[PDB]
Amino acid sequence: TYLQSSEGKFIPATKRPDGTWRKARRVKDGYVP
Amino acid sequence: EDFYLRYYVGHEFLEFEFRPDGKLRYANMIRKEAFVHQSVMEELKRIIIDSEIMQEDDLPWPPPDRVGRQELEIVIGDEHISFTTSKTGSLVDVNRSKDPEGLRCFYYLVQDLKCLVFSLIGLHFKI
Amino acid sequence: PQRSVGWILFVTSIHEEAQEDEIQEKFCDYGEIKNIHLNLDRRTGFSKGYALVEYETHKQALAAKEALNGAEIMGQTIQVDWCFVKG
Ligand SMILES: [Ca+2]
Ligand SMILES: [Ca+2]
Ligand SMILES: [Ca+2]
> Under a CB-based contact definition with an 8 Å cutoff, are residues B34 and B127 in contact?
no
CA angle, residues B97, B27, C36, in degrees to nearest 5: 90
Strands (E), B19-68: 23-27, 31-36
Which one of the ligands is nearest to C17 CA? 1
Ligand 3 center from residue C30 Cα (angstroms): 19
Domain ranges of chain A: 1-33
> Under a CB-based contact definition with an 8 Å cutoff, are residues B61 and B19 in contact?
no
Q: What's chain A's length in residues?
A: 33
Separation CA B95–CA B33 (nearest Å): 35
Solving technique for this entry? X-ray
SS3 B95: coil
Cα(first)–Cα(last) distance of chain A, in Å? 13
Domain ranges of chain B: 1-127
Instruction: Please give the domain boundaries of chain C with CATH numbers for all domains.
Output: 1-87 (3.30.70.330)
C-alpha torsion C5→C7→C13→C17, nearest 10? -80
Q: What is the CA radius of gyration of chain C?
A: 12
Contacts of C40 (CB under 8 A, 6+ apart): B115, C46, C47, C48
Which amino acid, B16? F
**Of all residues in chain C, what percent are helix, strand and coil, respectively (each to 5)?**
25, 40, 35
Nearest to A17 among B57, B91, B105 (CB): B57
Number of A:B CB contacts under 8 A? Answer: 20
Ligand 3 center from residue B125 Cα (angstroms): 34
What resolution does the deposited structure have, in angstroms? 1.9
Tell me which CATH homologous superfamily contains domain B1-127. Mago nashi (3.30.1560.10)
